[PDB]
Structure 1
Amino acid sequence: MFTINAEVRKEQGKGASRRLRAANKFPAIIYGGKEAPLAIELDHDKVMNMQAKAEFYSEVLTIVVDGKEIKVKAQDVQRHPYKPKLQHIDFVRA
């Protein structure tokens, strides 16, 4: 049971992503199905402990935002080239 506390993104782009990622909060996005893609913003250290388990990329995740229980699955991850940290995770809505 991987529950992630996340927020909706208000800004985007190169400058916006680097600003919020430097605040220990790397961005992501939830897409899939037929709804519009939801650019999401979430804390880095919380997911960094959960993503170290092998079951993080195989079970269905429940990312909560605005009180909404969204059944989501991890599609792809953009890790840092040389640092033990994440930059962006692609979340497929399953």
Structure 2
Amino acid sequence: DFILNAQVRSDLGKGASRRLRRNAGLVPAVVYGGDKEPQSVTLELREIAKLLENEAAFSHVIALNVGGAKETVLIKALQRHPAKGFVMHADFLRVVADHKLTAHVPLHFINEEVAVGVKQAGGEISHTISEVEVSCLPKDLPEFIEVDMAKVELGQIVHLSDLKAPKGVELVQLAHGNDLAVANIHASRV
């Protein structure tokens, strides 16, 4: 499931880190956060690359296992090769039972076939954004935020305030007094 294995990294630097990717086939990583000193760990590339095609990979909670001591983490940021695209570095944020945390949550758009602006007016659908910054307690962190586009007419805009959210979830950008277009309907290009 959401299981990752790690070993304690000891050699730090550019030359040491370039050697892991070339010979050992491992990936440097960091486990910071919580109330502890940060820990530098390493993990195998073919295992992190297999957890990353799960759709709810970043918005779920991982069970990291460093050596024989396991704990609760979350994919906080990720580094990829600009050209090839594989992952080079990754950092994990520790999860505390009573502490607010932030995450990136993808949006599950639904029932676009029977939208009023598409079935009747013959318009298109454009997803302006595909994830939203959220902030919530770990116990109620959603896998996806569901946006419903059934009763949408041609030219009608959908903003952050339009979509619903589960309990105890803030949209961060909305809290900053900045709601922005999520999706819209418009006439065909040609």
Q: Name the TM-score, length of structure 2 as normaliser.
A: 0.48
| Residue identity opposite 2:91 in structure 1 | D
Is 1:11 the counterpart of 2:27? The answer is no
1:81 counterpart SS class: coil
Shift of residue 84 of structure 1? 3.0
Larger Rg belongs to:
2
| Residue identity opposite 1:10 in structure 2 | S
Distance 2:92 2:18 in 1: 20
User: Which 10-residue stretch deviates more, 47-56 or 70-79?
Assistant: 47-56
Shift of residue 62 of structure 1? 0.6
| Residue identity opposite 1:51 in structure 2 | L
Structure with greater proportional helix content:
1
Query: Deviation digits for residues 53-81 of structure 1, max 9, x if unmatched?
Result: 22110111011012112100010000111
Aligned position for 2:67 = 66
Question: What do you get for the CA RMSD once the two structures are aligned?
Answer: 1.0
Shift of residue 51 of structure 1? 0.7
Distance 1:80 1:53 in 2: 20
Shift of residue 52 of structure 1? 1.4
Is 1:81 the counterpart of 2:85? The answer is no
Aligned length: 94
2:57 counterpart SS class: helix
Distance 1:6 1:56 in 2: 17
Distance 2:25 2:52 in 1: 15
2:90 counterpart SS class: strand
1:59 counterpart SS class: coil
Shift of residue 31 of structure 1? 0.4
Distance 1:86 1:31 in 2: 19
Aligned position for 1:29 = 30
| Residue identity opposite 1:18 in structure 2 | R
Query: Deviation digits for residues 25-71 of structure 1, max 9, x if unmatched?
Result: 11110000110001011000011011112211011101101211210
1:35 counterpart SS class: coil
Identical-residue share of aligned pairs (%): 38
Aligned residues of 2:5 and 2:67 also touching (Cα < 8 A): no
Structure 1 residue runs of 4 or more that deviate by more than 6 Å after TM superposition? none
1:54 counterpart SS class: coil
| Residue identity opposite 1:2 in structure 2 | F
Specify which structure has the bigger relative contact order, considering alpha-carbon pairs within 8 angstroms and separated by 6 or more residues.
1
Shift of residue 90 of structure 1? 1.4
Q: Name the TM-score, length of structure 1 as normaliser.
A: 0.94
